[PDB]
């Protein structure tokens, strides 16, 4: 007998009441602009299927970024194409501002805003409560948005999410790995950071929803506001839920995993183990306290469930006390 089926509880149709064209993103035909508008001038990094440059635009002198796309699915291609132009506006979401393709190879390539990104070390030695507060407050507003709108982010991590901290600017960049969610719809639990992967994923449970983000979002405030970073650090897929369960404590990993009849490993079973749920203020410490208050440990709470049906949804976590100086 297989895994009991699930829903997004929240914006669970947004793209059933939507017309074709807005999801449909392998009938998306590309108006492409001009790449002789753009001098690369220095690589920032490279990934898989990408590498990533900061670029002049020569028409207005004005900074950009150049994500030139490796020979990879046409499909995936246009999936983060159609996804970007879809959230295109939206509070905190990473602004597309052209599509090139070279005239002669047909190398694409996504050019970006520019942001000027803060270093980590000095982010790490500066944010106060209040900047952790704002900056969550701010990814709040861009994954409720995409979540409105339909769609999944499935990679946020810390490195996703540029801050220029001196104009206190957010954007929540590389839609790469991001979705539409469909109900019923089985998705690939390859996605996101091992460090930020929800349990879902980790038992590989195909129907997940919106609320993987939210997981996500948990594990970067646990790592913000303890100074431990990344918070759960396994060394693999698997040693990764181990990580998880020795601080949710096994029982309501199990509890989970039996709610929606879930099939596990012989072997995770051995190597899970049985642990405690541990309380928050175990992870408090003369180091991080001044980021730390009962209203934060409140919200992480409730972000850090095994159930992804339990968990807040962004809108809910907006509303949270953690927020009331923010608002
Ligand atoms: N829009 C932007 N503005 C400035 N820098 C950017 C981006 C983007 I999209 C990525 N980067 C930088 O390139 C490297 C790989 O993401 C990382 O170092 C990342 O910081």
């Not at 950071?193 to 594990?219: A, H, I, N, T």
Request: glycine share 4%; aromatic share 12%.
């Amino acid at each position: 007998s297989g895994p009991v089926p699930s829903r997004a509880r929240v914006y669970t149709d947004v793209n059933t009441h939507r017309p074709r064209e807005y999801w449909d993103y392998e009938s998306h035909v590309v108006e492409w602009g001009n790449q002789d508008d753009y001098q690369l001038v220095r690589k920032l990094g490279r990934g898989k299927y990408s590498e990533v440059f900061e670029a002049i635009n020569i028409t207005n002198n004005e900074k950009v970024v150049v994500k030139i796309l490796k020979p990879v699915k046409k499909k995936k291609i246009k999936r983060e194409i159609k996804i970007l132009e879809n959230l295109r506006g939206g509070p905190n979401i990473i602004t597309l501002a052209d599509i090139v393709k070279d005239p002669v190879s047909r190398t694409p390539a996504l050019v970006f805003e520019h942001v000027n990104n803060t270093d980590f070390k000095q982010l790490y030695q500066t944010l106060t409560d209040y900047d952790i507060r704002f900056y969550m407050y701010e990814i709040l507003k861009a994954l409720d948005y995409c979540h409105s709108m339909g769609i999944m982010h499935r990679d946020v991590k810390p490195h996703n999410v540029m801050i220029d901290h001196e104009h206190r600017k957010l954007r929540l960049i590389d839609w790469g790995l991001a979705e539409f969610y469909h109900p019923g719809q089985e998705y690939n639990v390859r996605v996101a950071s091992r460090y930020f992967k929800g349990p879902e994923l980790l038992v590989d449970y195909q129907m997940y929803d919106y609320s993987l983000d939210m997981w996500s979002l948990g594990c970067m405030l646990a790592s913000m506001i303890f100074r431990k970073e990344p918070f759960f650090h396994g060394h693999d897929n698997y040693d990764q839920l181990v990580r998880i369960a020795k601080v949710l404590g096994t029982e309501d990993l199990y509890d989970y995993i039996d709610k929606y009849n879930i099939e596990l490993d012989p072997r995770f079973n051995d190597i899970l183990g049985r642990h405690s749920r541990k309380r928050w203020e175990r992870f408090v410490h003369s180091e991080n306290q001044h980021l730390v208050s009962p209203e934060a440990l409140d919200f992480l709470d409730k972000l850090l469930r095994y159930d992804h049906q339990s968990r807040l949804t962004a809108r809910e976590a907006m509303e949270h006390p953690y927020f009331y100086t923010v608002v």
